[PDB]
């Protein structure tokens, strides 16, 4: 009984490994060997966005590529205007502890969450010229870590109870729950077609989920430690993950294979957040060594360093237009690079 | 700039002023982080001074705010890396789970992101420990072989009126904890062991004095003295 099930699982894993080994014919580095390198890119801090009285955990660019919403432990959800460094709104929260933030594609709503296990929704473009709680999404067991909006009424939230969920704003209860993870889920990322999304947990594995079916599709495991953050390739057939192993990993969906390893001998510090570019050539990442590094997605070479922070960086974000980059760190100031 | 831009700048200035006022008001309170395990008197200690639970209290016109979260704390512990102190309670009476308590304390102390957060450590339920020592049913040497060769250090002067074996046991436990703390302390952050019981009411003064010493050390570091 139990022995037969274990043998069947072992055989399934063995045939998965055989299929994985058979699909790997030539390394991506060997194919893109005759590709001109992007060279060294040096980006300076165009404007610093000061005004936070405590450390910062999250940030998300808007669709218009002008508004940032930064989540900080001072109990505020300041909304910054990137062009003029203007604070559009100041949102005091019930709970100071925060590790996630979101911005609606329409720009009308913001979402926040932390150790209170509740995803607060604030409506910006409304009457009485104020930002107020719209829905206090509750029902999670573990701490909330990453939220991303699909529409103005549909959310995907990752919590600390090794599960993800898709919630409906109007209804107020979970539309669908996603379970199967064994480790703490630390991040979440969406896709341009808004049909599939990838999530990273603390069990050294990333997993793809379908918003419609509500069941897992693919599970990739190539990391030795927890995956702190994940970003998804703009094309829609790949993504990138970052762990505490001081290495990033670019996986692809169509092949179900690990493609490249991103690591350097000098760095030992882990990855906090990763982000891609509009074209997808450059893969951004943030490390514990109080700076960021720009790495090429095809060469795995250090293209430049963004050492503008004092403490280790928390979040990195790229605008929809790809014009600029935002890095929010625990130094209480988030910097804009271009 | 346009008139709308100037008005937006004025609004931003007012928002920044409100932010500064709120930050100044919030920074006046001293925040702590309470940790423990099962059969550890977190509830009795926190009620003595009375997803995430929080408490007020005040000592000598100084406000303290306490946070406790209700395994694998390696992730949410990153939130509390700017707090003034981490209180860690341990059940000194129970010997079965004392070793895993030592392991937990070692994981907390050597945590990479608590590299500058001092720890105030509480040996809760001292009367239960004294009763267990008096009974003699449970022996420390059964669990910790080094207790047999251990002796009470000189110049101790614990308190008036406890048996020498009780003092020996309590200082053996305290020496274990202090050795774990000072294995890689390097002087950036130190531990404050204390002997508290379930009925003791002077548990706020100990925390007040320990946090006062922590802030004194921080100020000494700030003036470049150390």
């Amino acid at each position, epitope marked *: 009984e139990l022995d037969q099930l274990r043998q069947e699982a072992e055989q399934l894993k063995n045939q998965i490994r055989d299929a994985r080994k058979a699909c790997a014919d030539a390394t991506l580095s060997q194919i893109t060997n005759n590709i001109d390198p992007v060279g060294r890119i040096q980006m300076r801090t165009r404007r610093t966005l000061r005004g936070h009285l405590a450390k910062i955990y999250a940030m998300h660019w808007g669709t218009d590529s*002008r*508004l940032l919403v930064s989540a900080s432990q001072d109990g505020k959800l300041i909304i910054w*205007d990137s*062009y*003029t460094t*203007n604070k*559009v*709104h100041a949102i005091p929260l019930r709970s100071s502890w925060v590790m996630t933030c979101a911005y609606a594609p329409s*720009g009308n709503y913001v979402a926040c969450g932390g150790l209170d296990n509740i995803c607060s929704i604030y409506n910006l*473009k409304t*009457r*009485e*010229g*104020n930002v107020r709680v719209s829905r206090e999404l509750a029902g999670h067991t573990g701490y909330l870590s990453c939220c991303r909006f699909l529409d103005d009424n549909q959310i995907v939230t990752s919590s600390g109870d090794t599960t993800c969920a898709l919630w409906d704003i109007e209804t107020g209860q979970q539309t669908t729950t996603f379970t199967g993870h064994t480790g703490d889920v630390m991040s979440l990322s969406l896709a341009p077609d808004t049909r599939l999304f990838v999530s990273g947990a603390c069990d050294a594995s990333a997993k793809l989920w379908d918003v419609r079916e509500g069941m897992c599709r693919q599970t990739f495991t190539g990391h030795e430690s927890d995956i702190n953050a994940i970003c998804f390739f703009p094309n829609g057939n790949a993504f990138a993950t970052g762990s505490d192993d001081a290495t990033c990993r670019l996986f692809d969906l169509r092949a179900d294979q690990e493609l490249m390893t991103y690591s350097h001998d000098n760095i030992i510090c882990g990855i906090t957040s990763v982000s891609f570019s509009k074209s997808g050539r450059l893969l951004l990442a943030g490390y514990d060594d109080f700076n960021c590094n720009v790495w090429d997605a095809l060469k795995a070479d250090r293209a430049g360093v963004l050492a503008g922070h004092d403490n280790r960086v928390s979040c990195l974000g790229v605008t929809d237009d790809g014009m600029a980059v935002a890095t929010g760190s625990w130094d209480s100031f988030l910097k804009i690079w271009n | *700039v*346009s*008139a*709308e*831009d*100037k*008005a*937006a700048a*004025e*609004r931003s200035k*007012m928002i920044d002023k409100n932010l500064r006022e709120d930050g100044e008001k919030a920074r006046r309170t001293l925040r702590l982080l309470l940790l423990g395990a099962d059969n550890s008197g977190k509830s009795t200690i926190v009620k003595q001074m009375r997803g995430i639970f929080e408490t007020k209290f005040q000592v000598d016109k100084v406000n303290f705010h306490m946070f406790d979260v209700g395994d694998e704390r390696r992730k949410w512990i990153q939130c509390f890396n700017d707090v003034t102190a981490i209180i860690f309670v341990v059940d000194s009476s129970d010997y079965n789970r004392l070793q895993e308590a030592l392991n937990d304390f070692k994981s907390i102390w050597n945590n990479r992101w608590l590299r500058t957060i001092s720890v105030i450590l509480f040996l809760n339920k001292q009367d239960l420990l004294a009763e267990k020592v008096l009974a003699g049913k449970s022996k420390i040497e059964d669990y910790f072989p080094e207790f047999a060769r251990y002796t009470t250090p000189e110049a101790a002067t614990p308190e008036p009126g406890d048996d020498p074996r009780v003092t020996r046991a309590k200082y053996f436990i305290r020496k274990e904890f202090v050795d774990i703390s000072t294995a890689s302390g390097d002087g950036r952050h130190i531990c404050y062991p204390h002997f508290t019981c379930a009925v003791d009411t002077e548990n706020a003064r100990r925390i007040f004095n320990d946090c006062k010493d922590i802030i004194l050390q921080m100020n000494l570091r700030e003036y470049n003295l150390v």
Partner: single-chain antibody
Amino acid sequence: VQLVESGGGLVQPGGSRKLSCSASGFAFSSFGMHWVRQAPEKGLEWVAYISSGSGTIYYADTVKGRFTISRDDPKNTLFLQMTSLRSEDTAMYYCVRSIYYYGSSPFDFWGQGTTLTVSSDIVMTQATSSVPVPGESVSISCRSSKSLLHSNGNTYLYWFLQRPGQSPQLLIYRMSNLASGVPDRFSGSGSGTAFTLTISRLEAEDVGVYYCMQHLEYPLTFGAGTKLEL
């Protein structure tokens, strides 16, 4: 939200009068206040503006030196004090709330106005005064002395519609964005010193007076006004 103003009446020339406007349903402190005048037989003219927290107070050229404005946030009230008034100050007073940030809609709500009877600037031009017209597209053109386009790329002109016998409401701000509650039938475009407002499938309750108002720099100046008739 509600904004109601009280005061006014028959007053001898040269006297001092107080107009008090009270607000409910919204944060008065965040919003900035505007006092504007409507002559009984003429168009709208701006009078005064006060920012959030009374940080900046601006007055019109005509009323400079004899008009004072104040606001009491805890009481959610706005006071206007008038001294040495003239015979030209007899008009209807309108109080307007305006919020100022990126993507905001200034002049979104107009409070109920009062009536007072007494015993350089950018010029707005409206070529059409009365245009006969339901169900037919109507185009209204407004011209400015100088281009209302700043370096940042933001254009500053607002279109206001006046119903017969009550406060105006905003239709189009920045000549492109549509205010909340405005039907999609309204549309706006324009270029340097020439702005156009287009209405398609005109229906009932669209009769009113159209004003084009420039907000690039103070003092605020309103359009002459275009009347639409059946």
